[PDB]
Amino acid sequence: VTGSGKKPWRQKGTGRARSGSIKSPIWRSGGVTFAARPQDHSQKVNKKMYRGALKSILSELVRQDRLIVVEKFSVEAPKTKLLAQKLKDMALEDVLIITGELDENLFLAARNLHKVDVRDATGIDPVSLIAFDKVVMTADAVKQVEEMLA
Amino acid sequence: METIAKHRHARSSAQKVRLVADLIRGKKVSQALDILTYTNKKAAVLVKKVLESAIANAEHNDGADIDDLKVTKIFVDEGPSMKRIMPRAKGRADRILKRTSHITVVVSDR
């Protein structure tokens, strides 16, 4: 805290509680007692605990009928009107699309739909598999996660 | 019909004005005006101008009769105080309060 190290008033004689700094955390405009610093909140997850938790999540998506497998899922032009019409064709509202290898038309077409995320088989994460209601995987991608999960 | 007149930020303590306001509470305006004329207090000059303004407000804005008005309510509230500094001996400083008041006079024929 900006200021001086000067003792505000002498130790004895003035009939007032003793002070040693204007910066003390007791005083108005003083320092914070346990002031914070930038910290790293990252944790460690073992490799076998991360892969064991994706297998647990994937098995629940098939038990709860939240996993959909097709062989092909793409659109013909990079138009958002095409994908929204295509998902209306399958009664899919809030969906996660996992593909074998991402084609650019499907990535541009879903950038503006805030309830659709389009991902490739490598970039899946545990939270989005739980956050979205339905998951749509091309079977290009279903076999790619099997070797990923041994 | 009840009619109000106020003097806000009047320069005198509220305890000094309350002595004069207790003289005319419940009186007729005929009788409250001569009690204030022969009271030798600085607060009796402040209270009489708020009482004369409440009579003119009742006659002009409300069409009332001076003959039948009475002082039904009168009360003095405290206002903001001004903080001054007074030097004492041996370099000590005192704080002087210059107290103000809010005088409220209420007249009505009922």
Partner: peptide, 17 residues
């Protein structure tokens, strides 16, 4: 400010040696 002089004064203060 400085203290009260009677609290400084040796005769008044140091009354019980």
């Amino acid at each position: 400010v400085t203290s009260k002089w009677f609290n400084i004064d040796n005769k008044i203060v140091d009354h019980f040696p």
